[PDB]
Amino acid sequence: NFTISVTTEILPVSMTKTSVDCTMYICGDSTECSNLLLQYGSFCTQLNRA
Amino acid sequence: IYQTSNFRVQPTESIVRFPNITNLCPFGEVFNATRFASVYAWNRKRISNC
Numbered sequence: 001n002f003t004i005s006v007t008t009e010i011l012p013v014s015m016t017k018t019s020v021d022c023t024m025y026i027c028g029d030s031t032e033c034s035n036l037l038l039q040y041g042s043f044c045t046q047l048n049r050a
Numbered sequence: 051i052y053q054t055s056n057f058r059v060q061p062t063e064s065i066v067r068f069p070n071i072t073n074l075c076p077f078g079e080v081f082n083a084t085r086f087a088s089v090y091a092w093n094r095k096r097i098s099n100c
């Protein structure tokens with residue numbers, strides 16, 4: 001004799017599509033901070049691309 | 051689709067809120083007086099509410 005047993009199997013497929021902006025996070029909406037951040041270079045482009 | 055910047059709304063005006071009193075603090079007697087006690091026993095001038 002045989003039995004049929006349904007088995008559940010869970011698999012994550014995706015996570016939340018987050019996004020981070022420097023001048024909002026790195027700078028508290030200031031101006032001099034923006035000057036210094038643009039002085040540091042192109043880290044923010046790399047972060048946004050990633 | 052590209053993500054370039056953030057929709058930032060600039061502030062309109064500059065509100066300033068300071069207490070409404072007009073008592074001048076006595077800095078003149080503090081900076082220059084007839085006698086100042088020496089280092090072994092120095093005084094405390096508690097400037098408050100001016």
Ligand SMILES: *[C@@H]1O[C@H](CO)[C@@H](O[C@@H]2O[C@H](CO)[C@@H](O)[C@H](O)[C@H]2NC(C)=O)[C@H](O)[C@H]1NC(C)=O
Pocket residue numbers: 001002
């Ligand atoms: C195979 O197994 C099933 C499940 O146990 C059997 O079905 C049961 O049979 C008994 C009596 O034989 C009943 O009292 C139950 O109500 C049945 N259960 C269900 C879910 O139908 C089936 O009889 C077995 N087959 C053989 C040839 O033994």
Ligand SMILES: *[C@@H]1O[C@H](CO)[C@@H](O)[C@H](O)[C@H]1NC(C)=O
Pocket residue numbers: 078079080082083084
């Ligand atoms: C300290 O000097 C200033 C300068 O004129 C004067 O107005 C003030 O009365 C002086 N403070 C004193 C003498 O305690």
